[PDB]
Amino acid sequence: GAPVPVDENDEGLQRALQFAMAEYNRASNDKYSSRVVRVISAKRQLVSGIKYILQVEIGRTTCPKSSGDLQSCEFHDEPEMAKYTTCTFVVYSIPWLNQIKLLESKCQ
Numbered sequence: 001g002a003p004v005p006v007d008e009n010d011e012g013l014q015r016a017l018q019f020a021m022a023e024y025n026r027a028s029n030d031k032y033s034s035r036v037v038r039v040i041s042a043k044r045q046l047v048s049g050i051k052y053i054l055q056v057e058i059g060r061t062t063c064p065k066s067s068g069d070l071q072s073c074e075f076h077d078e079p080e081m082a083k084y085t086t087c088t089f090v091v092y093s094i095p096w097l098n099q100i101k102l103l104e105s106k107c108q
């Protein structure tokens with residue numbers, strides 16, 4: 001009948017995590033200009049199995065994804081409130097009937 005919050009006590013979600021790291025690998029194409037920052041929240045829904053709708057805040061920068069070479073790093077100057085992009089992940093996961101996927105990343 002409705003959505004609910006996700007508990008970080010289940011270690012089975014550590015798999016759906018490797019999914020977001022991939023969709024992101026093809027979303028940043030190059031190796032610079034794009035970079036994630038932090039998570040905004042996460043709620044799980046049900047549709048046969050479970051689903052994880054997250055709201056991430058990704059921005060641009062002079063680094064290759066998370067880590068990389070050189071140091072400095074930054075979203076081009078000090079745009080603590082500029083140059084950014086919100087997005088939401090919709091993961092799918094269900095070991096009870098053979099299922100698990102990654103719908104997509106709703107980013108604008």
